Design a protein around this nucleic acid. Structure first.
Length: 58
RNA sequence: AGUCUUGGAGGUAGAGCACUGAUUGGACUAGGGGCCCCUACCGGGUUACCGAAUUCAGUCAAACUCCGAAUGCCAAUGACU
Protein backbone atom coordinates (compact mmCIF):
# COMPACT_ATOMS: atom_id res chain seq x y z
CA UNK A 1 0.00 0.00 0.00
CA UNK A 2 0.95 3.66 0.41
CA UNK A 3 2.45 5.46 3.38
CA UNK A 4 3.21 9.07 4.23
CA UNK A 5 6.65 10.27 5.31
CA UNK A 6 7.17 13.61 7.08
CA UNK A 7 9.81 15.19 9.32
CA UNK A 8 9.70 16.14 12.95
CA UNK A 9 13.35 16.90 12.58
CA UNK A 10 15.95 18.85 10.65
CA UNK A 11 18.99 17.36 9.00
CA UNK A 12 21.45 20.05 10.12
CA UNK A 13 23.23 18.48 13.07
CA UNK A 14 23.30 14.92 11.68
CA UNK A 15 26.12 12.99 9.92
CA UNK A 16 26.76 12.71 6.19
CA UNK A 17 25.55 9.10 5.96
CA UNK A 18 22.07 10.03 7.16
CA UNK A 19 22.04 13.32 5.24
CA UNK A 20 21.93 12.05 1.66
CA UNK A 21 19.32 9.39 2.52
CA UNK A 22 16.93 12.21 3.40
CA UNK A 23 17.64 13.74 -0.03
CA UNK A 24 16.88 10.48 -1.85
CA UNK A 25 13.47 10.31 -0.15
CA UNK A 26 12.52 13.64 -1.72
CA UNK A 27 12.63 15.19 1.75
CA UNK A 28 14.52 18.49 1.69
CA UNK A 29 13.20 20.93 4.30
CA UNK A 30 11.30 20.12 7.46
CA UNK A 31 7.59 19.21 7.55
CA UNK A 32 7.64 18.28 3.85
CA UNK A 33 4.99 15.57 3.48
CA UNK A 34 5.99 12.90 0.94
CA UNK A 35 4.07 9.71 0.06
CA UNK A 36 5.59 6.49 -1.30
CA UNK A 37 4.68 2.83 -1.65
CA UNK A 38 5.11 0.23 1.08
CA UNK A 39 8.22 -1.47 -0.31
CA UNK A 40 11.12 -3.06 1.56
CA UNK A 41 13.60 -0.83 -0.29
CA UNK A 42 12.17 2.36 1.20
CA UNK A 43 11.46 0.45 4.43
CA UNK A 44 15.19 -0.26 4.68
CA UNK A 45 15.84 3.48 4.64
CA UNK A 46 13.32 4.05 7.43
CA UNK A 47 14.74 1.10 9.38
CA UNK A 48 18.15 2.71 8.88
CA UNK A 49 16.96 6.05 10.26
CA UNK A 50 13.54 5.86 12.04
CA UNK A 51 14.33 8.89 14.21
CA UNK A 52 14.40 11.96 12.02
CA UNK A 53 11.06 10.76 10.68
CA UNK A 54 7.59 10.27 12.10
CA UNK A 55 6.17 7.53 9.88
CA UNK A 56 2.56 7.60 8.73
CA UNK A 57 0.69 4.56 7.45
CA UNK A 58 -2.70 4.47 5.75
C1' A B 1 24.35 8.58 -5.08
C1' G B 2 21.06 6.00 -1.18
C1' U B 3 18.22 1.67 0.37
C1' C B 4 17.01 -3.63 -0.15
C1' U B 5 18.95 -8.04 -2.41
C1' U B 6 22.87 -12.36 -2.91
C1' G B 7 28.31 -12.57 -3.35
C1' G B 8 32.77 -11.97 -1.24
C1' A B 9 38.17 -9.56 0.28
C1' G B 10 40.07 -8.37 5.25
C1' G B 11 42.15 -10.54 10.82
C1' U B 12 40.62 -5.57 15.11
C1' A B 13 37.00 -5.06 19.68
C1' G B 14 35.87 -9.39 21.82
C1' A B 15 37.11 -14.15 23.12
C1' G B 16 40.94 -18.49 23.36
C1' C B 17 45.79 -20.17 25.51
C1' A B 18 46.40 -24.88 20.37
C1' C B 19 52.00 -21.56 18.34
C1' U B 20 54.61 -17.43 20.61
C1' G B 21 56.30 -15.23 25.02
C1' A B 22 55.08 -14.05 30.19
C1' U B 23 53.28 -16.20 34.71
C1' U B 24 50.46 -18.76 39.42
C1' G B 25 49.88 -23.44 42.36
C1' G B 26 49.81 -28.61 43.43
C1' A B 27 51.23 -33.60 42.36
C1' C B 28 55.47 -35.96 40.26
C1' U B 29 60.68 -36.28 38.90
C1' A B 30 65.45 -37.08 35.69
C1' G B 31 69.38 -34.83 37.61
C1' G B 32 72.03 -31.68 41.00
C1' G B 33 74.41 -30.54 45.30
C1' G B 34 73.89 -30.68 50.73
C1' C B 35 73.16 -33.55 56.66
C1' C B 36 76.58 -36.39 55.52
C1' C B 37 76.92 -42.43 56.51
C1' C B 38 79.80 -46.24 55.02
C1' U B 39 84.64 -43.56 52.66
C1' A B 40 89.90 -44.56 46.04
C1' C B 41 84.70 -37.60 44.57
C1' C B 42 84.40 -44.06 44.79
C1' G B 43 80.02 -47.97 47.68
C1' G B 44 74.28 -45.28 48.98
C1' G B 45 71.11 -43.69 51.84
C1' U B 46 68.60 -39.34 53.00
C1' U B 47 65.42 -34.64 53.32
C1' A B 48 59.92 -30.55 51.95
C1' C B 49 67.85 -28.46 49.94
C1' C B 50 66.77 -27.44 44.96
C1' G B 51 64.96 -29.10 40.76
C1' A B 52 64.74 -29.60 34.13
C1' A B 53 61.19 -32.23 31.97
C1' U B 54 56.10 -34.20 33.21
C1' U B 55 50.96 -33.69 33.44
C1' C B 56 46.47 -31.44 36.57
C1' A B 57 43.89 -26.95 37.34
C1' G B 58 45.05 -21.48 36.79
C1' U B 59 45.66 -16.51 34.79
C1' C B 60 47.82 -12.74 30.83
C1' A B 61 49.28 -9.64 25.40
C1' A B 62 50.38 -3.08 20.76
C1' A B 63 54.55 -6.34 17.90
C1' C B 64 50.14 -14.40 20.83
C1' U B 65 46.69 -16.38 17.17
C1' C B 66 43.52 -22.82 16.03
C1' C B 67 38.98 -18.48 16.42
C1' G B 68 36.31 -14.23 15.20
C1' A B 69 31.43 -10.06 15.15
C1' A B 70 29.15 -5.26 14.27
C1' U B 71 30.15 -1.81 10.74
C1' G B 72 33.15 0.42 6.94
C1' C B 73 35.06 -0.79 1.32
C1' C B 74 35.34 -2.80 -3.54
C1' A B 75 31.12 -5.47 -6.09
C1' A B 76 27.45 -8.00 -9.37
C1' U B 77 22.29 -8.04 -9.54
C1' G B 78 17.54 -6.20 -10.05
C1' A B 79 13.93 -3.05 -7.57
C1' C B 80 12.46 1.83 -5.68
C1' U B 81 13.24 6.95 -4.75
Amino acid sequence: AKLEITLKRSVIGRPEDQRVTVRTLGLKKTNQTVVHEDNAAIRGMINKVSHLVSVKEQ
